[PDB]
Nucleic acid binder design. Structure first.
Ligand SMILES: [Cl-]
Ligand SMILES: [Cl-]
Ligand SMILES: [Mg+2]
Ligand SMILES: [Mg+2]
Ligand SMILES: [Mg+2]
Ligand SMILES: [Mg+2]
Ligand code: NA
Length: 228
RNA sequence: GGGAUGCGUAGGAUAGGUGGGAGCCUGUGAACCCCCGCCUCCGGGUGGGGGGGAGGCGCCGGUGAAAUACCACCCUUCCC
């Protein structure tokens, strides 16, 4: 069969037609998290954009009220004194155009990459393909590039996450853990939704949030009302 | 509403996109063997049945632009 019996039991706990309020969803999440770890909770949205149009792309950040519920691993690529600054800002792995080969040799143990401007030429040319399409190439307007590297890293450690729509027009984020008490999950969800809406492209066709869902790392989904 | 389909090269080999994921599946019958339908890029994939009778898969590692389980929103091409 397509799923195991564990997953199949979860299918009886959700209505496929209902669009749930965010509070209902936040309360249901724990019933849909039956894997043997604390499952990340996710929000997904199909977006009223043409994704193949650069000017209707949706990229941005939000500081999650209660964060992801896990250690966030930041790779900072910097030069000279920015190396030390990155480090004292709690970045976990910090270096120069050196460690580009470390990423090119395929170490991908980071949840965010941030970089100073003076390294972005190398980062661009060498990690452009590996990180580009995924919106992971440090970028001045996902706020992952700057000389204020310490400031950028602190925001990330304090719960800031990035989102970028995919080439199909959907967008997705982790917004916490299913062990989060329901009001806290609901807090994170609303924050992500608010931020997603803050980057609605000027002039795109139709409703911006065509559909919105909450789901757990290995459970079924719950369609939600983003304005609840 | 259901189902199918997703293959440059390297790589176990058929890696659609992105996000999640450190575990997942398994007497609700694992590997492996065979039959049939469908699909096929001619490598195989996929669905069902039967045999078998207790493991297999993922992480890690390797290769790669991207990593396999598992889950989510989607997109491609079809079919009932
Ligand atoms: Cl700056
Ligand atoms: Cl919705
Ligand atoms: Mg995936
Ligand atoms: Mg990953
Ligand atoms: Mg499994
Ligand atoms: Mg038998
Ligand atoms: Na999921």
């Amino acid at each position: 069969p397509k799923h195991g019996k564990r997953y199949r039991a979860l299918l009886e706990k959700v209505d496929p037609n209902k669009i749930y309020t965010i509070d209902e969803a936040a309360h249901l999440v724990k019933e849909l998290a039956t894997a043997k770890f604390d499952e990340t909770v996710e929000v997904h949205a199909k977006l009223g954009i043409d994704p193949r149009r650069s000017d209707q792309n949706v990229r941005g950040t939000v500081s999650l009220p209660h964060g992801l519920g896990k250690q966030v691993r930041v790779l900072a690529i910097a030069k000279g004194e920015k190396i030390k600054e990155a480090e004292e800002a709690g970045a976990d792995y910090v270096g120069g155009e050196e460690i580009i080969q470390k990423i090119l040799d395929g170490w991908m143990d980071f949840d965010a990459v941030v970089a100073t401007p003076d390294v972005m030429g190398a980062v661009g040319s060498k990690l452009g393909r590996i990180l580009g399409p995924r919106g992971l190439l440090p970028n001045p307007k996902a706020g992952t590039v700057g000389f204020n590297i310490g400031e950028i890293i602190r925001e990330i450690k304090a719960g800031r996450i990035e989102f970028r729509n995919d080439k199909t027009g959907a967008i997705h984020a982790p917004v916490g853990k299913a062990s989060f008490p329901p009001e806290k999950l609901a807090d994170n969800i609303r924050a992500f939704i608010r931020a997603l809406e803050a980057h609605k492209p000027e002039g795109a066709k139709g409703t911006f949030l065509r559909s919105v869902y909450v789901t757990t790392a290995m459970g079924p989904s719950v369609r939600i009302n983003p304005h609840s």
